[PDB]
Structure 1
Amino acid sequence: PPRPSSGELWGIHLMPPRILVECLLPNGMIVTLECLREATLITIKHELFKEARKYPLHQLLQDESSYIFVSVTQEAEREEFFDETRRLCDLRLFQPFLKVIEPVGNREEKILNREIGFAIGMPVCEFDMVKDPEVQDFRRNILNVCKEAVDLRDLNSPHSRAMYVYPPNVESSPELPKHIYNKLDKGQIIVVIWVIVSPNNDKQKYTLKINHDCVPEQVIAEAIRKKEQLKLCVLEYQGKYILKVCGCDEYFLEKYPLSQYKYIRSCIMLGRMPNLMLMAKESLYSQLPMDCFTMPSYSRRISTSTKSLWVINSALRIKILCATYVNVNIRDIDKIYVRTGIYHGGEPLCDNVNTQRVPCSNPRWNEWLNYDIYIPDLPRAARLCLSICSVKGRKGAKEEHCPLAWGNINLFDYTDTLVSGKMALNLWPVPHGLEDLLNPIGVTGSNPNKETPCLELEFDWFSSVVKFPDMSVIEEHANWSVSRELRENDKEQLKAISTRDPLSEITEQEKDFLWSHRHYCVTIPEILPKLLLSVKWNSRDEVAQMYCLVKDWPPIKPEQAMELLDCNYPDPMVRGFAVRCLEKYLTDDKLSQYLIQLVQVLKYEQYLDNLLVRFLLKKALTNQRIGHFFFWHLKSEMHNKTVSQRFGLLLESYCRACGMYLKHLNRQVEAMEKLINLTDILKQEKKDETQKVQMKFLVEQMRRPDFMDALQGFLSPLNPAHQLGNLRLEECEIMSSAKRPLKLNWENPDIMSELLFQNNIIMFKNGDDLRQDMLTLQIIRIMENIWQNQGLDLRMLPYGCLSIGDCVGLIEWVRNSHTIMQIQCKQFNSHTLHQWLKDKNKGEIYDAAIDLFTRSCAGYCVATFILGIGDRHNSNIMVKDDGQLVHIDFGHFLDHKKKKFGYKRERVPFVLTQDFLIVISKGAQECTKTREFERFQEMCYKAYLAIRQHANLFINLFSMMLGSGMPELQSFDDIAYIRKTLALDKTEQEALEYFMKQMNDAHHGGWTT
């Protein structure tokens, strides 16, 4: 199983300089060898066979070369060490011993499996031991995805190979927004093409002035043209060079308008000079090793009457036998019972049925529970959601019910087979914060930890294997059911329903209305989420008719289709249609943008093999910008036993087919394990120690040859295009603040790093949950992106943030930024901030700063208020030398203060102070009365309605995150906060009045209409 701690041994963080290692020779002898902790395995094997001669039966030992070592790793695995160039300190040994063995088996396969197991953080061999057929079938059947991907990748020899490794970082539309287009001097861009001339590697600039929608080849053509029969030369030599962004590994390999590329689009917008690098296809295409997919061991082996559900004339009943135990103080509780429910997503299909109350000490029920559902009426995604609740009725007539352990089961399995006979379910601890007696959003399946309450269950037997009917049988029954006048007004009511946010109230009258007009609904395809909620999922007649309608339903926008993938839409045909919409209309820019949510919704999936996991995997293996984040999002959650087996099997198939990128990933992984280990020492054995000594230990351990080999020359997990070269040890720091994170400075090793950034500074935080910060910066990017396309230059700087494990992750350090608290020092004025900005941007570019400050202020003012970000202060808010305002630490969102203090209020987290107002008003005495502030109020009123116009998207993004484990995001009611700040139950005029009132009450007047 996964490694307990990231130390060099069990209960030892770092090995002493020299360590005694027990060596188990093949003749049966044992040799105690003194080893240097950084000694490679080839050196150790040389010293051991020399020393072996001094022990009996040495004559039985073959050549040193005929052997390899095997030991017990921290993952409790017997690992064979084929890479004899590895150091003893990097072996992850449980205890200091080595067993000498003659290597048998498939060498190639054993090495790959070790490399995959190291990336995953779990040994592959644990999956082979899993008895469950679904698990083994998933590992078998997912390989066509892996095979198709590697086929597409080498179809176009070096080009398709390069398109996987360096995909185009392009926007979803070439259509330049009006406000961006006006920055182009006469509808055309000025680019700077740099080139390293081969004799002395001297940089040479060629400044072009070409049209924005000029394909990269045309940009190359004009570079050769700059240097009337020249056309023959350029036509032949324009296919022998490719363009690259100066300072990072971003390449212009596909025929997209130059303006469609994100670097170019950002440059136009920010009034910056695009610096590109001309190089030949040959110098890139050669550095590309051919990726090879191999059919694994488990594939090359087999590994080993029917009735319809509809021909069953009975109502559903499930028997609760007994439970092993529960953890309850016998004095504090009366009885215990098993609460059950049949659910379709988060909605019950019938009333919840409890068992009789029994003493905690005697959890035996042996009772049949009867449900108000006719077995033919059972939908395909029907589940049994149960739990063991306690019950006490000491104070008054008030009974206090408390869930002890929960578990969910799929009434049908992955083969469409209804569950029959006895079943043992190991239950899960109740999540923190959840108060409900049932957990329908929770994962399906037994708890892998067998040292937990176990519940026995009996499912009915009908004398045969009951299968859910075929799609031909369902299409038939729908034509039977349908066989058993528009009005301009009715078409208006329908139109109004489809425009409502996904969490708004649907009355029973509106439900009957929507179902009655289901055939007209195909004209307004966006109505499908609300219509699917007008269906009676506990009726096979309506379910059948819906299946037909969805089969030939027109495709919808991806953002509208993502809704059909949350916990509220479990039907395989719904999620099937939903996946087809993403397949045909979701761009690689949007998939990368909504990846967090797309990975999350994989948890709601009933089965391991599904169309979503296949779509996502196909894409992760087709694009390695997608594959890098797919790998990290899944990896960050491998400690969570609720998803570790699903994500583990997913990571296996991914690493098995991603090719050479596994080697780069393994480098990122081994770099991270070292930082986790270094920060674990400081947090434990060195917590009650001086910051001066802490740094002396830090610099000494960071100078170690084993540490440097691993923490230099690897890709950044925050952006794979960013190479992290040599660690600039002098600029590395342990931050003074309690939490004590690591500030690490790496040198950008790019040839022309000077044109981008020469240093890559990343913060390594070990102790805090970065997922909330991760989701906030994601939503903020999605907010700004809406504003830009609607013509708003509210320019926020959402820096990179990634969760790499349980309460461990990386944060981009924003260069040239200072906190307000820092600016207010080096006995303080309300002008200190304005003064600092006037002094850091003198004369001409004073207004360019004030514009940047006011625009970013409005962005943050609207973003923070909508989301309900944790209380803002001088330590949380920072300003760059530019004037660029940036907010840090978004650990809390929505009404996080609702449980602590009962006060129902939508707060204004970002109240612009006098200090802030002075900066916008350019130093004026009456700041609210200025024209500068009028343009600010206007920006906010626009930003707010832009977001309110896109509410549906944000509500879906949040809804897709309910099963993630985020404290502030555990129920649809937690999402109701966004419906209050965006005032969705009101009119756009009322909503904007609400915003203005909220702004006034917090700023004490000034916000004029």
Structure 2
Amino acid sequence: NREEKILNREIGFAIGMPVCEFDMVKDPEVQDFRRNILNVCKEAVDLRDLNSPHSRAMYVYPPNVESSPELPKHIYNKLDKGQIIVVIWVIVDKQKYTLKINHDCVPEQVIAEAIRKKTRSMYQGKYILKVCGCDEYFLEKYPLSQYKYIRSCIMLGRMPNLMLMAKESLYSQLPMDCFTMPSYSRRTSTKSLWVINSALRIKILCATYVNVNDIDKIYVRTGIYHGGEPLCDNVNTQRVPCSNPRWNEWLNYDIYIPDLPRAARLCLSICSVEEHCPLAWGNINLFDYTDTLVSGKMALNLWPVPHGLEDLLNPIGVTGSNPNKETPCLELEFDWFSSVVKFPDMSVIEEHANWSVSREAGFSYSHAGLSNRLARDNELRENDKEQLKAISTRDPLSEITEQEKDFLWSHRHYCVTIPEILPKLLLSVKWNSRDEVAQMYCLVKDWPPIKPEQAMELLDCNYPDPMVRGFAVRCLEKYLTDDKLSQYLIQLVQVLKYEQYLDNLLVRFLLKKALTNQRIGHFFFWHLKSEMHNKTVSQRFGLLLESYCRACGMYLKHLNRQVEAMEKLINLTDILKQEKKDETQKVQMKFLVEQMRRPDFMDALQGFLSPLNPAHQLGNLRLEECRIMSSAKRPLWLNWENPDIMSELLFQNNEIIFKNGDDLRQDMLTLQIIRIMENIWQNQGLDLRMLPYGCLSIGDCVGLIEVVRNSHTIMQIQCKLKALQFNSHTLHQWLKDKNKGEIYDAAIDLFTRSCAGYCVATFILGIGDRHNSNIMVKDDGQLFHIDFGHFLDHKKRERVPFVLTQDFLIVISKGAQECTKTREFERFQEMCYKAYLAIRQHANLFINLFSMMLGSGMPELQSFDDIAYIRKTLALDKTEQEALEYFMKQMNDAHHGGWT
């Protein structure tokens, strides 16, 4: 118990709330989650001790690898006859050995060649390869070029520097995990829903804590929903004065109880009124986590309305009671049937489905004629098959008419042969019919596997059914690589919020992965931790974090170092940002330096892992290199030395901007999308180099941004001394001065290509207007953008954010005055055309990634109408050639010529 108490304190520190707060929660779903989730913890720990110590090292230092071993053409073409030059260092004093080897050599073979080289100058299974300058290892027998560091080196024409290291020197530094099961580990009739012959009704008793002025009459609005879809008409109570909110009114709903789907929810509000306004809203699950239909009395504390939403109900909103109990509390009563009513078992559901299928297969021509949702097997023509195929290739937010829905449902057995149509078929199901839903379940049960990218759609707010979501998860388990899981983790974390219950298949999958791959676990922790201030999710996220922190092993202690460092920076910046706001930069800096040198602060702010990338060790702070930036919120530009033995080879100092006051969630999302765009272009042989620098939200409007070394804003360059006297050639002159001689062409090429990428990316995403201060350029010509605080339809009709002025065209056309009518500009135009269509071809991915972020509280991504902006910029309703022409016209109009 002494050890457990010490652990609980550590967990409490990591999560920002004491573990005893979870102990006090009475709700049995909460206590069941805490206990039942521990088998995932056990399973993970068993995987980590399977082939110890290798398996422990693989957890801590997983291979940082691309999904596909196979290289593109333009990557392979960088290799000298499929061979790579690599430098292998040995500590003995630092001895480099330069090897020329085949790109697809395994680490063991590379090590052998390094020893063979060292031999000539005058075994293999005792060593491992480490990347020089950071804590990344090549512990697994992949092709060398599949490691991302290696593939990145080949792309950029940089020399790979790897360090030879004894296995036992690594293994020795990996403490043993001793996972201990916590204390909490040790802990009428029953009738089917389908037997209850009755309509649905619910009683609204009264509201308490209804405090108001403006407001005159009020009523309780209600509705039965499956996701965002109504299952019957809404039902209002009688009108009442706000000074006495009592209704005592049974509402009757147009739905039979046996037809209630598993994820059916009651969505209600309190409204004032003719102009109607909702004062407070709340949703609840009609079945609980044990499959029991709610019965008896219930008190629901309601939530405040968010501005932007003016609709009367909020079915997309969170489900469950407000934790703040000093809020409008509506009391409700459900119907009682002398018995516990439970949702039926799968065997009962399957039997019903088989009964229906058998029944339908016997239907005559004339019977089938009675409903467009019925078809006969023989009738299915090739023309119907083509129409189905055509419906399947439409994007996720393309409308499916009622006629198409009937059509899809009637040909649901054929839809099995085109399994990517599943999302469209599922939205065609009558979710208020048990006859249809039972058959949908049996189709889902045996549905062929779909790609993870397609499966992820089925985890958004449009697909609440647990069988559909379970199918989605099975697809990720079979087909989602750790690489792609890392890439889509932000979205996968967000869709946890749409789960009806704490314990579910998705959260079990994510937790297992977080606890078997520490690179995943790190960001899993930080994405959860960053929203613990949000009361609509803090319980779910807090309990999930608890379960992670109990089983993640030694990394908990490293996370607590990061948490303490961030907490010290939050505290310092809060003080600057309140007590010294008015003071000069000089005095603020004097205060900051004095506070950071206090030995407790100094120890907390040095010697820990970068939250932006835990492969990067942050050593001693260089206070002389730190500064408070001019910007409004007083961001800290911070500089630590990299204490790696071979830091000189990667970077000697790690520079991070810490910012306390701005919401960084949209930048973080935009940077993720840019990286995904870049990856699509690279995999297609289209080499447009982007710069998706690190950005991590760590809390409520607090986060970290990776500094891009040796870069400058456009303004600085064209400022020089010089505005009325600005000259279009100044930027070209700068780059040229920086790239004299044989390299000039490489710099112009890099500028051109990077420019094309950002032109296309920013137009597609509707990013905030570009100007000379939020466009930056590196010495080598790489152009990139910063500050992605705005996106999509943020103006309110499609803007062009990145207007190529004469400055940029002059660089592209190598100094020529008439730069719009040149060869270089034509090749640049061609790059933009290819990039644009390449993204159009992957439009469903981008739509789905945005759809998964809808239930986040990001101000410019509130509904599917915001996402519709992308449908416009990618011209998805148009033809591919019509889309090209549309893109050309937007560029043409914005540039006043050039694009035709």
- The answer to whether TM tops 0.5 is yes
Q: Deviations along 1:771-822, whole A, 9 cap, x unmatched? A: 0111000111111011110111110111000001000100001100111111
Corresponding residue SS for 1:528? helix
Question: Are the equivalent residues in 2 in contact too, given 1:381–1:412 (CA < 8 A)?
Answer: yes
1:318-467, aligned counterparts within 5 Å? 318-329=202-213, 332-391=214-273, 399-467=274-342
Structure 2: distance between partners of 1:400 and 1:247: 64
839-848 or 146-155: bigger deviation: 839-848
Matched positions, count: 872
Say whether residues 1:129 and 2:24 are aligned partners. Answer: yes
Question: Are the equivalent residues in 1 in contact too, given 2:227–2:461 (CA < 8 A)?
Answer: yes
Structure 2: distance between partners of 1:402 and 1:189: 67
Structure 1: distance between partners of 2:830 and 2:803: 17
Aligned partner of 2:586 among 685, 692, 712: 692
Question: Are the equivalent residues in 2 in contact too, given 1:325–1:363 (CA < 8 A)?
Answer: no
* Alpha-carbon distance, 1:488 to partner: 2.3
* Alpha-carbon distance, 1:327 to partner: 4.2
Say whether residues 1:925 and 2:800 are aligned partners. Answer: no
Question: Are the equivalent residues in 1 in contact too, given 2:502–2:540 (CA < 8 A)?
Answer: yes
Aligned partner of 1:885 among 783, 786, 789: 783
* Alpha-carbon distance, 1:831 to partner: 1.3
Q: Deviations along 1:667-699, whole A, 9 cap, x unmatched? A: 000000100000001110111111111111111
- What is the aligned partner in structure 1 of residue 370 from structure 2? none
* Alpha-carbon distance, 1:657 to partner: 0.1
* Alpha-carbon distance, 1:155 to partner: 1.1
Structure 2: distance between partners of 1:430 and 1:644: 19
Structure 2: distance between partners of 1:808 and 1:434: 26
490-499 or 715-724: bigger deviation: 490-499
* Alpha-carbon distance, 1:299 to partner: 1.1
Q: Deviations along 1:375-430, whole A, 9 cap, x unmatched? A: 00000000011111111xxxxxxx21111111110000000000001100000111
Structure 1: distance between partners of 2:78 and 2:228: 49
Q: Deviations along 1:344-382, whole A, 9 cap, x unmatched? A: 111111111111111111111111111111100000000
* Alpha-carbon distance, 1:915 to partner: 0.7
Structure 2: distance between partners of 1:759 and 1:542: 62
406-415 or 269-278: bigger deviation: 269-278
Corresponding residue SS for 1:928? helix
Structure 2: distance between partners of 1:984 and 1:147: 47
Percent of pairs identical after alignment?
99
Question: Are the equivalent residues in 1 in contact too, given 2:220–2:237 (CA < 8 A)?
Answer: yes
Q: Which runs of 5+ in 1 are unaligned?
A: 1-105, 228-235, 392-398, 897-903
Say whether residues 1:491 and 2:366 are aligned partners. Answer: no
* Alpha-carbon distance, 1:989 to partner: 0.6
* Alpha-carbon distance, 1:882 to partner: 1.4
- What is the aligned partner in structure 2 of residue 138 from structure 1? 33
Aligned partner of 1:840 among 738, 747, 754: 738
Structure 2: distance between partners of 1:877 and 1:560: 34
Corresponding residue SS for 1:601? helix
* Alpha-carbon distance, 1:766 to partner: 0.4
Corresponding residue SS for 1:659? coil
Q: Deviations along 1:107-146, whole A, 9 cap, x unmatched? A: 1011000000000000000000000000000000000000
Question: Are the equivalent residues in 2 in contact too, given 1:518–1:531 (CA < 8 A)?
Answer: yes
Question: Are the equivalent residues in 2 in contact too, given 1:192–1:273 (CA < 8 A)?
Answer: yes
Question: Are the equivalent residues in 1 in contact too, given 2:763–2:802 (CA < 8 A)?
Answer: yes
Q: Deviations along 1:478-507, whole A, 9 cap, x unmatched? A: 011112254222221111111111000111
Q: How high is the TM-score relative to the length of structure 1?
A: 0.86
372-381 or 208-217: bigger deviation: 208-217
Structure 1: distance between partners of 2:518 and 2:541: 18
Structure 1: distance between partners of 2:666 and 2:531: 14
Question: Are the equivalent residues in 2 in contact too, given 1:376–1:540 (CA < 8 A)?
Answer: yes
Question: Are the equivalent residues in 2 in contact too, given 1:319–1:366 (CA < 8 A)?
Answer: yes
Aligned partner of 2:353 among 454, 471, 478: 478
Corresponding residue SS for 1:934? helix
Structure 2: distance between partners of 1:831 and 1:548: 67
Q: Deviations along 1:27-48, whole A, 9 cap, x unmatched? A: xxxxxxxxxxxxxxxxxxxxxx
Q: Deviations along 1:306-363, whole A, 9 cap, x unmatched? A: 000000111111111111143433xx23311111111111111111111111111111
Question: Are the equivalent residues in 1 in contact too, given 2:612–2:704 (CA < 8 A)?
Answer: yes
Question: Are the equivalent residues in 1 in contact too, given 2:606–2:618 (CA < 8 A)?
Answer: yes
Q: Deviations along 1:152-209, whole A, 9 cap, x unmatched? A: 1011111000000000000111111111111111111111111111xxxx11111111
Aligned partner of 1:268 among 128, 132, 154: 154
Structure 1: distance between partners of 2:631 and 2:544: 38
Corresponding residue SS for 2:533? coil
Structure 1: distance between partners of 2:716 and 2:236: 60
Corresponding residue SS for 1:366? strand
Corresponding residue SS for 1:542? helix
Q: Deviations along 1:22-75, whole A, 9 cap, x unmatched? A: xxxxxxxxxxxxxxxxxxxxxxxxxxxxxxxxxxxxxxxxxxxxxxxxxxxxxx
567-576 or 696-705: bigger deviation: 696-705
* Alpha-carbon distance, 1:737 to partner: 2.1
- What is the aligned partner in structure 2 of residue 749 from structure 1? 643
Question: Are the equivalent residues in 2 in contact too, given 1:861–1:940 (CA < 8 A)?
Answer: yes
Q: Which has the higher helix share?
A: 2
In terms of Rg, which structure is larger?
1
Question: Are the equivalent residues in 2 in contact too, given 1:349–1:537 (CA < 8 A)?
Answer: yes
Structure 2: distance between partners of 1:237 and 1:410: 62
Structure 2: distance between partners of 1:994 and 1:372: 47
* Alpha-carbon distance, 1:475 to partner: 0.2
Corresponding residue SS for 1:404? strand
Q: How high is the TM-score relative to the length of structure 2?
A: 0.96
Structure 2: distance between partners of 1:403 and 1:885: 48
* Alpha-carbon distance, 1:861 to partner: 0.5
Q: Which runs of 4+ in 1 moved over 4 A?
A: none
Structure 2: distance between partners of 1:981 and 1:123: 48
1:995-1006, aligned counterparts within 5 Å? 995-1006=887-898
Question: Are the equivalent residues in 1 in contact too, given 2:209–2:326 (CA < 8 A)?
Answer: no
* Alpha-carbon distance, 1:658 to partner: 0.3
Structure 1: distance between partners of 2:94 and 2:801: 49
Structure 2: distance between partners of 1:345 and 1:809: 33
Structure 1: distance between partners of 2:284 and 2:259: 18
Corresponding residue SS for 1:843? coil
Q: Deviations along 1:617-673, whole A, 9 cap, x unmatched? A: 000000000000000000000000100000000000000000000010000000001
- What is the aligned partner in structure 1 of residue 770 from structure 2? 872
Q: Deviations along 1:822-866, whole A, 9 cap, x unmatched? A: 1122x4321111111111111111111111111111111011111
Corresponding residue SS for 2:416? helix
Corresponding residue SS for 2:314? coil
Question: Are the equivalent residues in 2 in contact too, given 1:433–1:967 (CA < 8 A)?
Answer: no
Structure 2: distance between partners of 1:801 and 1:880: 19
Corresponding residue SS for 1:321? strand
Question: Are the equivalent residues in 1 in contact too, given 2:617–2:643 (CA < 8 A)?
Answer: yes
Structure 2: distance between partners of 1:203 and 1:433: 61
Question: Are the equivalent residues in 1 in contact too, given 2:271–2:312 (CA < 8 A)?
Answer: yes
Question: Are the equivalent residues in 2 in contact too, given 1:326–1:404 (CA < 8 A)?
Answer: no
